[PDB]
Amino acid sequence: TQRVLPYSNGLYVINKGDGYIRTNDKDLIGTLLIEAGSSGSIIQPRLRNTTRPLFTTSNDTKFSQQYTEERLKDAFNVQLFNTSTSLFKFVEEAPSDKNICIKAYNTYEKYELIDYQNGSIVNKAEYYLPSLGYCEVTNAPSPESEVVKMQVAEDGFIQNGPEEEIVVGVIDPSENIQEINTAISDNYTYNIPGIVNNNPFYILFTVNTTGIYKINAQNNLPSLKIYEAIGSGNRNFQSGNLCDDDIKAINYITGFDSPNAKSYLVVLLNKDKNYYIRVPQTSSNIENQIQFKREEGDLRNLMNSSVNIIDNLNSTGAHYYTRQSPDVHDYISYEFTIPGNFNNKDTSNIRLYTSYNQGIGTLFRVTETIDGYNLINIQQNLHLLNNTNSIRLLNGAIYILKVEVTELNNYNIRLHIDITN
Amino acid sequence: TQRVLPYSNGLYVINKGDGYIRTNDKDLIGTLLIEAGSSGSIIQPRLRNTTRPLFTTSNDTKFSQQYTEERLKDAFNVQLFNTSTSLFKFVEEAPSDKNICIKAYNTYEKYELIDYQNGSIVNKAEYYLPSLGYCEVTNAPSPESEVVKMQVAEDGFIQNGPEEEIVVGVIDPSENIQEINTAISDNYTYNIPGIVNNNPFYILFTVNTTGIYKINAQNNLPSLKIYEAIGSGNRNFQSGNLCDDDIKAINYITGFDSPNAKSYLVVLLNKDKNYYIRVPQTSSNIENQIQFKREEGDLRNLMNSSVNIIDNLNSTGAHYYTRQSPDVHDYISYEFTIPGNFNNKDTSNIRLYTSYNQGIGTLFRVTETIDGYNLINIQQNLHLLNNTNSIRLLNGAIYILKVEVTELNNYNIRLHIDITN
Amino acid sequence: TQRVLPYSNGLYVINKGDGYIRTNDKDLIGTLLIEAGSSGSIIQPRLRNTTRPLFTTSNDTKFSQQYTEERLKDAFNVQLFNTSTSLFKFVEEAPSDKNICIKAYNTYEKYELIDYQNGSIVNKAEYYLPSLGYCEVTNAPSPESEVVKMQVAEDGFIQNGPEEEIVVGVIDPSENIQEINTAISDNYTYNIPGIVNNNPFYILFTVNTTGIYKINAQNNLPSLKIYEAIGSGNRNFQSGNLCDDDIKAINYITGFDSPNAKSYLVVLLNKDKNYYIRVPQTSSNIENQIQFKREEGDLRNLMNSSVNIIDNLNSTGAHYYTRQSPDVHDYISYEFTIPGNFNNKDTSNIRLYTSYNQGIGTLFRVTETIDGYNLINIQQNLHLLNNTNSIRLLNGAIYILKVEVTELNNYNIRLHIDITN
Amino acid sequence: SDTIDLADGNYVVRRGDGWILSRQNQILGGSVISNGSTGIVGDLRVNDNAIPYYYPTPSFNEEYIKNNIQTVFTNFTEANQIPIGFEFSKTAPSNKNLYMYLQYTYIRYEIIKVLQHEIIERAVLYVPSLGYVKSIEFNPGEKINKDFYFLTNDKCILNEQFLYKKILET
Amino acid sequence: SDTIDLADGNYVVRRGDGWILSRQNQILGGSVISNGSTGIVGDLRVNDNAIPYYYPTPSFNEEYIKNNIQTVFTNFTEANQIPIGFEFSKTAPSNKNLYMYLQYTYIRYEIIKVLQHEIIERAVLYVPSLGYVKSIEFNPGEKINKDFYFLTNDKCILNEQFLYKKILET
Amino acid sequence: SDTIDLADGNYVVRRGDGWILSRQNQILGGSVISNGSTGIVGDLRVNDNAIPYYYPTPSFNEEYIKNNIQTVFTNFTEANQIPIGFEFSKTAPSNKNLYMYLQYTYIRYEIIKVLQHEIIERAVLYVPSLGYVKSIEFNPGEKINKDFYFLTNDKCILNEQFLYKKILET
Ligand SMILES: CC(=O)N[C@H]1[C@H]([C@H](O)[C@H](O)CO)O[C@@](O[C@H]2[C@@H](O)[C@@H](CO)O[C@@H](O[C@H]3[C@H](O)[C@@H](O)[C@@H](O)O[C@@H]3CO)[C@@H]2O)(C(=O)O)C[C@@H]1O
Ligand SMILES: CC(=O)N[C@H]1[C@H]([C@H](O)[C@H](O)CO)O[C@@](O[C@H]2[C@@H](O)[C@@H](CO)O[C@@H](O[C@H]3[C@H](O)[C@@H](O)[C@@H](O)O[C@@H]3CO)[C@@H]2O)(C(=O)O)C[C@@H]1O
Ligand SMILES: CC(=O)N[C@H]1[C@H]([C@H](O)[C@H](O)CO)O[C@@](O[C@H]2[C@@H](O)[C@@H](CO)O[C@@H](O[C@H]3[C@H](O)[C@@H](O)[C@@H](O)O[C@@H]3CO)[C@@H]2O)(C(=O)O)C[C@@H]1O
Ligand SMILES: [Cl-]
Ligand SMILES: [Cl-]
Ligand SMILES: [Cl-]
């Protein structure tokens, strides 16, 4: 009954909430018994600035405390771990009727650092950042009930703060960040430099005018991913140039991790934002280029998604293609050619369906003119999950299927393209 | 019109209350004139921890300030004399009608250290421990009445705190404390070691089972005193063993100071308590032993008291015996033999009375069996003070008179045993 | 439309009020947005004692910051300029209805140091002493109105405290202060010592009995000024002696600055006060004396004022005499002789008037007896301003005109004495 | 857009107090108070929490930014050496739990280059001001809006301002 | 008695917060407030008032006590190096005098040896927690109960507790 | 006058708390609070604000003054080494402005020489006590009484006192 985490490969820092306390009173500051009418206070005055963060890792050599702290700084801009100048204080006035107790606990804000790879966590660290306390008030204990013995609880935490799950992706520090210093207009070709050979790396770039862009490598290989720098473009600005604010907190937009898969990106970019492209590890010594193109035509209908180029569709029968499933309400696209000669008459029966994930699909007929690529919407509201409906398409023709995930039941999405005749 | 202090010989520390201030504004912190509706505060923030205790002694060479402080530590566990981390603060909001003044004074908790010997104080020290202040509010002074001149008061203190007299006896530090490491059951014989020859000393011991014990030295010489360690047995515990918590705060139970007087102790001891026996200075080189015996029989009726063995009762006429009077509701006992041959027929007229202190007496006939000592109650509710009533007792028979003091008019109790025939 | 400042020559320190802040938010501490029901505080806890006074001068070499501070100490007894141990704190509870903002500003108390000479300021310094803050609360800003751009204001201050103008004269530090150590009774002659030759200086003296005194130099040259030491005589006291409290804060009483003008002083002196006489720079090497005389007779009617001795009145026609005008409700007097032989019959027509300042005048006939000087009031309620009324006076007779200024329109007062016949 | 009715040249701009920064919102931690109690959180602006955030541009480096801001507006280098405190108080209603968290506020300063009624270059400086607390009453297991915890873009909790002065050449 | 339904062996036991010690009650002093005024007394738990009270036994020495307590429950050596304050407020009613005095509270820990459903050995550790104030309104010359001033035996001002864990052999 | 019903000789006199000094009134500064807000000003009596003001006479020099005062009355040299704080609170009414300023208060001591029912010599010592705030509500441009700001002669804001003791010869 585990949730499906449709996260892209990479690092994530997760704020799992505030007000965590350890078990067995390990973080009890103390209790005050306040008589009726009176008041009582418990104070953390910061006469000393020292705090005691808690840390556990599954991998001391990669996710060390130093590394984990740098990741929390990348994500949420935390900078004080050992120290604090922030005071907290709890005050309670007991009502005129009865006496009152207040218990004060030290608390922690829980951060989880994960390395997520191909559908599971491969590295995990928990960092409990010292917080600003928890105060529970109760009625005064009566004499004496009776003391009932209790075994200690297992080691662990209890949250007393509100529910919270804030997920922030972060730049992998082991990978280089190259920059495109000039803002991108209608076209741009980025040559992949030898300074970053073979290893995966990021490309930081911005755009001149808000619009939809097609991004890809030569022959759509390898597949790329694109991120948005969270909170970028709110500050320093130079017309037609990139302003790097050293933001390592990233929002995944679209893109596959499988590098041998042909694909291209169609994304809406804001001129007041910075974006990261991640190009993966390539096992070839051949020179490559990242191409940027502003889309003014029908290709705009594919935002935001990666478009898979399907090549092996040259015989009839059953064919399937597996990719990482987009999250709910996100898109994935497929460009394919019906096998056979295009003679504008010969046709084949095509059945498109998914195996586990429910998706709404729209089918486009693709024709390239001297004005660019034209998309004719020929099928709408296709419900893909175990779809038995079939349609007759032209042999040798080119089609694009755009799929919106609506029910995420599997980490992967499996598209089937069954062809008969 | 002086009170009678029925204290046993030894050292006492007396908490005489809080909120003492010196005369002539010597401890005035200051005055705040608060206008109507406004508020005012006077604060002791402990930015410096220094305090200034006051001390006077009648004997610098025994009751020095060092010694006196050690005695206050023995009694009440005070440990900070020069310093304090305890804050105090006074706040006043003036009513909407009139203006208000608040005067704040530094205060002292007054401790008296006394050496009490044979019915008077022979050494005396006063230690004024710095306390947490006194705040009096008054209406705003009017213009101008007129300033009337006043001579300064004599040097001294004024108490503004509530009435308090807490008397705590303490172990004399000049005397050794020997220990009985094994808890006492039915019988025990403690040999007096040569390491503590001649000098008075204490014996620290505990008991296995709550019960009444007879305690005495060889031939009931010398007379012993027994104390309870205040607050002992609340903490560390080992079955059948003594756990010494180094408690020097002692509650006198019973026992005489006159060492040449034959006596024994009959006391109720708790298994969850520690007790001190004080054996006095003995002017003999002969070996002695302290004997402990659990009483299961009629001797239980004598708790808690010392029993005086009277020996010189071999002629008719008037006889008197002086001892330190027990406090009100406390006991003292006397074991005596009617002069003459015991022939079960010859009898004498006996008159028992006290001179100044009123006491209720009960008379026991003592017969020793092979099962122990038997006590036959033959007289109840004897009002001893100037008693003229007389009773006929058997010559050569043994009797025990148990006296409960009900009116303490004299430091001493004087028992008279007048015998005629 | 400038005010007339009728100040005597010398130094003045003026407290121009509290709660001054600079323009363009230069002294903004910050803003707190407090939600409804909640409270917020802004605190200056003095964890560091450092403050930042502001200073501007027109003359760095005389009115330096050091000098100016010494003058503020002379006037108001300020002693801490760089530092402060005084805390301030602003607290605001937002009502249940709406949210609330509080803005806190650092403030300054503005002091002006002026050197005032012959009707204008010749040296000027402004010292802004760090004060205890300004707190304005406002309703919570609404989204979003719209941000309207504004050019910055000119550099300067804004007062948020109440209106204040406290003017305190101070002793010129460059001039010596000589002392008359014996309190003055009926008569005293102070010889001017060679230790203070030529240069102007002060004479500090007190009086034995409250009364009216005539003070002057030999032949009424030079003219003197008299000051009162503000707050003197409230403290240390020795019968018949002067007690110097080193008070340099002075209240001008009367006296002219023009040293070649013959005059004498008639002033009411309190025995519980100290007074300063300032004798000006004299361009003569001749020995001089200051004479003190207690007035018991008619000369008492001239208090408090300087009396000008007019000498050049030996022909008929128009004559005018210019002096510094006393402030409103203050006095100035003139002693003159009607030209001609005194034969008790020959008379002249005299017209007395002022040119710009309105004054009420009373005219005295002066006759000297063996009992002293006698003043016969011969004219009352003379309205001097452009007075056309004339009176017939005796040739060779001596008169004194006492003038009370009622309307100050000019820095100078111009008395005209027109004589016809 | 970035259009402004000003002449050509460089300007110092004070954009006002009350600015909060993105992502940074919960890094100081927060308090959980319950059932009638009062929670008070505060801080102390000195030394290494008063260090400002610079965002320079090719024309406007850090020293240029500092000097022009401290000349026209408040000198934050002198001011922030002297400790200033601030506190916030919240009271939990009976039988309910309240969570309150603290974050710093900043004065936002800008250096803008204007050419033909258009801002073509902008440098930004955030100087630490005071603080700001947000609070919410919550039940066990109640889902809370992400927006309450996490701020995606810098915003001003007050009304924004635009107080300018033209910078003249050396 | 000292009978307990546990197996044989040694145990660490947390007996709870709110313990006050005998004889010690008034040694910090107290305040006297009058006629409408408010008195506030407090303290600061650091260094040499946070030093705990050990009471070892032949089986359980101090180091054994410290290590087992700090392993299972709170590490007081690390915690008590960081200053924590606490305050109490009392208000005197009009035309009456009020005396308030302060004393520390402790967490009580125990090391017990159990043999045949019986506690045959017990070590005790008191670790300083916070504090507790008692107050009384008084007239001049009014006799006050001795029990108000002086505590003869250790007691818990709260409900006692018994939170145990069996200690396993080296 | 300076007539007193005492025998001949020298006396130490405690003239009471609550004395304010002339000219000195506003030198600590003041606060301006507005519209419902509360202003709290205070100070801390230590070291170099607790240094007393001596005013000796030919018979009574400073050391004579100090020794006789500290013998009979409070020893201010020992006392004023230990920091004591004091605070005042004022609340501005809605839609009005309030100005509050602070000044120190002093205990006034005197050494007097009496001859034939007459004080012929008097030395004075002012020892810093606590403080005192005056406040006023004001409108923009409203003229304020000079007496509110500036004190011409030393006065006691409380009732004056005269607590004497005759000084006996060495
Ligand atoms: C019609 C057909 O043959 N479909 C096969 C497809 C297509 O070859 C492919 O989708 C076109 O791009 O591939 C299938 O298996 C691939 C799939 O599992 C993906 C998942 O991302 O990975 C591919 O292998 C990767 C491997 O995972 C990498 O770690 C690395 O080793 O490289 C290889 C690629 O060279 C699988 O080939 C599919 O299910 O989509 C199988 C279809 O039969
Ligand atoms: C019937 C009779 O003789 N009674 C005398 C009694 C008994 O001898 C005695 O009580 C039996 O133990 O003793 C009386 O005087 C003694 C009494 O004052 C006690 C007070 O505690 O002290 C005895 O002297 C002590 C002395 O006080 C010590 O300081 C030390 O010197 O030792 C001697 C004892 O050797 C008195 O002898 C009595 O009143 O009880 C006198 C009776 O006549
Ligand atoms: C009737 C007559 O001549 N009146 C003249 C008067 C009288 O001579 C004088 O008032 C009697 O004392 O003087 C007038 O001018 C004098 C006047 O301006 C005063 C102002 O204080 O100053 C005198 O000159 C000063 C000069 O200002 C000083 O700086 C210094 O240089 O010394 C001289 C004095 O020697 C003027 O002589 C007057 O208006 O009062 C002119 C009258 O005509
Ligand atoms: Cl699927
Ligand atoms: Cl008796
Ligand atoms: Cl005129």
- Give the domain CATH number at D89: 2.170.15.20
Number of continuous H segments (helices) and E segments (strands) in chain F? 3, 10
C-alpha B299/C-alpha B293 separation (Å) is: 11
Q: Reported resolution in A?
A: 2.7
Q: Which of C21, C22, C34, C39 to mutate to test the interface with D (most CBs of D within 10 A)?
A: C39
Classify A342 as helix, strand or coil.
Answer: coil
Q: Is the CB of C117 under 6 A from ligand 3?
A: no
User: What are the φ and ψ backbone dihedral angles of A71, each rounded to 5 degrees?
Assistant: -75, -35
Nearest CA in chain F to C106: F31
Terminus-to-terminus CA distance in chain B, angstroms?
Answer: 42
Q: Is the CB of A281 under 6 A from ligand 1?
A: no
C-alpha B277/C-alpha B178 separation (Å) is: 10
Cβ contacts (< 8 Å) between C25 and chain D: which residues?
Answer: 14, 17, 73-74, 163
- How far is CA B295 from each of CA A80, B269, B364, B404, F95, rounded to the nearest angstrom? 71, 11, 17, 21, 86
Query: F8 lies in which domain range?
Result: 1-170
Do B298 and B375 meet the contact criterion of CB atoms below 8 Å apart?
yes
Q: Is the CB of A342 under 6 A from ligand 1?
A: no
Structure tokens at A119: 């559908």
Q: Is the CB of A414 under 6 A from ligand 1?
A: no
Closest CA to E79 of E41, E123, E130: E130
The position carrying tokens 């050292």 is: B11
The position carrying tokens 């908790």 is: B109
Do C101 and C33 meet the contact criterion of CB atoms below 8 Å apart?
yes
- CB–CB of A109 and D41 under 8 A? no
Structure tokens at A86: 């922030």
Does a cis peptide bond (omega within 30 degrees of 0) precede residue B304? yes
Closest partner CB to C25 (pick from D73, D88, D90): D73
Closest CA to B180 of B73, B289, B304: B289
C-alpha B350/C-alpha B421 separation (Å) is: 9
C-alpha D12/C-alpha D166 separation (Å) is: 6
**Bridge partner residues of E124 (DSSP):** E55, E110
Beta strands in C299-371 (DSSP E): 305-309, 320-324, 331-337, 347-354, 358-369
C-alpha C22/C-alpha C26 separation (Å) is: 6
Around Cβ F94, how many Cβ atoms within 10 Å? 9
Local structure of residue D57 (DSSP, 8 states): -
Q: What structural domains does chain A harbor?
A: 1-141 (2.170.15.20), 160-311 (no CATH), 312-421 (2.60.120.1090)
C-alpha B412/C-alpha B326 separation (Å) is: 8
C-alpha B315/C-alpha B305 separation (Å) is: 27
Nearest CA in chain D to C44: D84
C-alpha A170/C-alpha C63 separation (Å) is: 62
Is the CB of C129 inside 8 Å of chain F's CB atoms? yes
Do B366 and B400 meet the contact criterion of CB atoms below 8 Å apart?
yes
Structure tokens at C303: 């208090």
The position carrying tokens 């840390």 is: A55
Classify B413 as helix, strand or coil.
Answer: strand
The position carrying tokens 């937002």 is: C94
Do B20 and B158 meet the contact criterion of CB atoms below 8 Å apart?
yes
Structure tokens at A350: 């095509």
Protein residue closest via CA to atom 34 of ligand 1: A260
- CB–CB of D42 and A137 under 8 A? no
Classify A64 as helix, strand or coil.
Answer: coil
C-alpha C5/C-alpha B149 separation (Å) is: 48
DSSP secondary structure letters along A375-395:
EEEEEEEEE-BT----EEEET
Protein residue closest via CA to atom 25 of ligand 1: A258
Task: Give the contacts of F170 (CB within 8 A, at least 6 positions apart).
Answer: none
Q: Which of B307, B320, B356, B415 to mutate to test the pocket of ligand 2 (most atoms within 8 A of CB)?
A: B320
Task: Give the contacts of C171 (CB within 8 A, at least 6 positions apart).
Answer: C11, C74, C177, C202, C248, C250, C276
Maximal CA-CA distance, chain B: 96
Do C104 and C30 meet the contact criterion of CB atoms below 8 Å apart?
yes
Task: Kindly give the distance from the C-alpha atom of residue A409 to the centroid of ligand 4, in angstroms, as a whole number.
Answer: 8
C-alpha D129/C-alpha C78 separation (Å) is: 31
Classify F99 as helix, strand or coil.
Answer: strand
Cβ contacts (< 8 Å) between F161 and chain B: which residues?
Answer: 147, 150
Nearest CA in chain D to C46: D83
DSSP H or E segment with residue C51: none
Q: Which residue type, as a one-letter code, is found at position B378?
A: I
Tell me how far the alpha carbon of residue E135 is from its chain's centroid: 18
C-alpha D166/C-alpha D111 separation (Å) is: 10
Structure tokens at C59: 């003359």
User: What are the φ and ψ backbone dihedral angles of C331, each rounded to 5 degrees?
Assistant: -115, 155
Q: Is the CB of C356 under 6 A from ligand 3?
A: no
Classify F69 as helix, strand or coil.
Answer: helix
In B241-270, the residues whose Cβ lies within 8 Å of chain E are 241, 243, 245, 249
Local structure of residue F133 (DSSP, 8 states): E
Cβ contacts (< 8 Å) between D105 and chain C: which residues?
Answer: 30-31
Closest CA to C229 of C246, C211, C214, C216: C246
C-alpha C272/C-alpha C265 separation (Å) is: 20
C-alpha F22/C-alpha B89 separation (Å) is: 30
Task: Kindly give the distance from the C-alpha atom of residue A403 to the centroid of ligand 4, in angstroms, as a whole number.
Answer: 11
Q: Say how many domains are in chain E.
A: 1
Annotate C217-246 with b (16+ C-beta within 10 A) or e (fewer): beebbbbbbbbbbbbbbbbbbbeebbbebe
Closest CA to E123 of B250, B245, B274, A151: B245
Q: Which residue type, as a one-letter code, is found at position A196?
A: V
Task: Give the contacts of A371 (CB within 8 A, at least 6 positions apart).
Answer: A297
Q: Is the CB of B411 under 6 A from ligand 2?
A: no
Distance from CA of B70 to the nearest CA of F (A): 25
C-alpha C381/C-alpha C358 separation (Å) is: 12
Tell me how far the alpha carbon of residue B61 is from its chain's centroid: 24
C-alpha A327/C-alpha A333 separation (Å) is: 14
Distance from CA of D69 to the nearest CA of C (A): 11
Structure tokens at C390: 């004339």
Is the CB of A52 inside 8 Å of chain D's CB atoms? no
What technique determined this structure? X-ray
The CB-side HSE value for A373 (13 A sphere, CA atoms) comes to 18
- How far is CA B212 from each of CA A140, B153, B191, B255, D121, rounded to the nearest angstrom? 40, 56, 22, 15, 98
Q: Which residues of F touch B (CB under 8 A)?
A: 4-6, 14, 17-18, 42, 44, 46, 72-75, 78, 81-91, 105, 129-133, 135, 157-165
Q: Is the CB of C321 under 6 A from ligand 3?
A: yes
Task: Give the contacts of F145 (CB within 8 A, at least 6 positions apart).
Answer: none
In B59-118, the residues whose Cβ lies within 8 Å of chain F are 101, 103
Closest CA to C271 of C336, C213, C357, C202: C213
Do E120 and E48 meet the contact criterion of CB atoms below 8 Å apart?
no
Structure tokens at A312: 């092996």
Protein residue closest via CA to atom 19 of ligand 3: C322
C-alpha A267/C-alpha C297 separation (Å) is: 109
Q: Which of E88, E155, E156 to mutate to test the interface with A (most CBs of A within 10 A)?
A: E88
Tell me how far the alpha carbon of residue B130 is from its chain's centroid: 26
- CB–CB of C149 and D42 under 8 A? no
Q: Which residues of D touch C (CB under 8 A)?
A: 4-6, 14, 17-18, 42, 44, 46, 72-75, 78, 81-91, 105, 129-133, 135, 157-165
Structure tokens at B103: 């005067």
Q: Which of F14, F17, F106 to mutate to test the interface with B (most CBs of B within 10 A)?
A: F17
Distance from CA of B214 to the nearest CA of F (A): 57
